[PDB]
Amino acid sequence: SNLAIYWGQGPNQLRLSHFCQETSLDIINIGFINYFPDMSPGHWPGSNFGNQCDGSVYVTNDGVVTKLLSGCHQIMEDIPICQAAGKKVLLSIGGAYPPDQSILSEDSAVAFATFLWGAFGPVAEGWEGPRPFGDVVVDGFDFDIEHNGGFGYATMVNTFRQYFNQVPERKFYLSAAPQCIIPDAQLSDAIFNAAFDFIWIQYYNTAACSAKSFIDTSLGTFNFDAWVTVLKASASKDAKLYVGLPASETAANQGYYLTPDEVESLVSTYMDRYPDTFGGIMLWEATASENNQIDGAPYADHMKDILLH
Numbered sequence: 001s002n003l004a005i006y007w008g009q010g011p012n013q014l015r016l017s018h019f020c021q022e023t024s025l026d027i028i029n030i031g032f033i034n035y036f037p038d039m040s041p042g043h044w045p046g047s048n049f050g051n052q053c054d055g056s057v058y059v060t061n062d063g064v065v066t067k068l069l070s071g072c073h074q075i076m077e078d079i080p081i082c083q084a085a086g087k088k089v090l091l092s093i094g095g096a097y098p099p100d101q102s103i104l105s106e107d108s109a110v111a112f113a114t115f116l117w118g119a120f121g122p123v124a125e126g127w128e129g130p131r132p133f134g135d136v137v138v139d140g141f142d143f144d145i146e147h148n149g150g151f152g153y154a155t156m157v158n159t160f161r162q163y164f165n166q167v168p169e170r171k172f173y174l175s176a177a178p179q180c181i182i183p184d185a186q187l188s189d190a191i192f193n194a195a196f197d198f199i200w201i202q203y204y205n206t207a208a209c210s211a212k213s214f215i216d217t218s219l220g221t222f223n224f225d226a227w228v229t230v231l232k233a234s235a236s237k238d239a240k241l242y243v244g245l246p247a248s249e250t251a252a253n254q255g256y257y258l259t260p261d262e263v264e265s266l267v268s269t270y271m272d273r274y275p276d277t278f279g280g281i282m283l284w285e286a287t288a289s290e291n292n293q294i295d296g297a298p299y300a301d302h303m304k305d306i307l308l309h
């Protein structure tokens with residue numbers, strides 16, 4: 001039913017508003033808040049959106065240079081277009097670079113979520129901190145934690161929910177991007193102990209359980225069945241599960257991209273098998289989709305057709 005895509009790390013990517021105009025996209029995850037407070041300058045989080053933003057950064061009130069970008073003008077301009085078009089825009093935390101970020105304590109997990117809520121959530125009279133996207137309010141937060149284990153993330157999720165519940169008139173969302181092996185070293189703890197709305201399983205780069213292994217069963221064993229089972233047991237039991245795929249041949253490691261016809265064979269099986277739990281498709285990522293035109297349309301448009309068929 002829904003199609004989610006990452007944007008922000010594509011080489012020479014088009015600006016976000018280009019993807020705000022793409023009807024087929026339902027959810028866009030903007031990557032990334034990639035530096036975490038415990039190990040970053042000023043103890044502020046830091047951000048990177050590839051070729052976007054003017055390169056300026058915030059300083060702390062004592063003059064310490066942070067890694068949080070302060071001139072993301074096109075992003076600020078573009079998010080409201082996405083939302084006007086009915087898309088959900090989630091700010092993604094983590095991403096694969098750098099490899100050395102984690103959360104060291106319960107207190108800092110809570111403080112990280114508090115900061116992000118203040119900086120990127122609803123505008124509040126009592127916040128005197130940075131507003132990197134101005135008066136824009138994101139639709140929630142994606143946990144793309146790719147290194148260093150699982151500590152802290154459940155606490156962050158729970159903290160965000162407490163905050164969401166103070167704004168009962170607006171819906172916000174939380175998501176996670178585990179890889180396919182169960183247990184997932186970064187996110188099984190958060191999925192077991194806290195409640196995500198969406199979970200997109202990355203079904204590329206691990207041979208044991210990839211989407212490609214549905215097509216060629218000699219490679220591995222595609223394990224969406226196992227993920228349904230593990231979720232029914234978790235605090236995330238009401239999450240919808242998405243199949244995460246590369247949007248071109250070069251978006252991930254060699255051998256993990258599926259043709260539209262291959263995706264249709266997988267999705268038809270699994271959407272039929274799990275009509276309530278199967279949420280849709282997630283794509284890595286917007287620029288690879290856009291650059292992979294098939295019969296005059298980007299890969300993402302072909303994915304939505306499969307989902308609606």
Ligand SMILES: COc1ccccc1-c1noc2nc(C)[nH]c(=O)c12
Pocket residue numbers: 006009095096097144146177202251252284
């Ligand atoms: C290890 O793979 C990566 C290294 C650096 C930057 C991005 C990736 C990456 N490849 O597929 C991905 N998929 C997700 C959800 N997040 C990522 O960071 C990546």
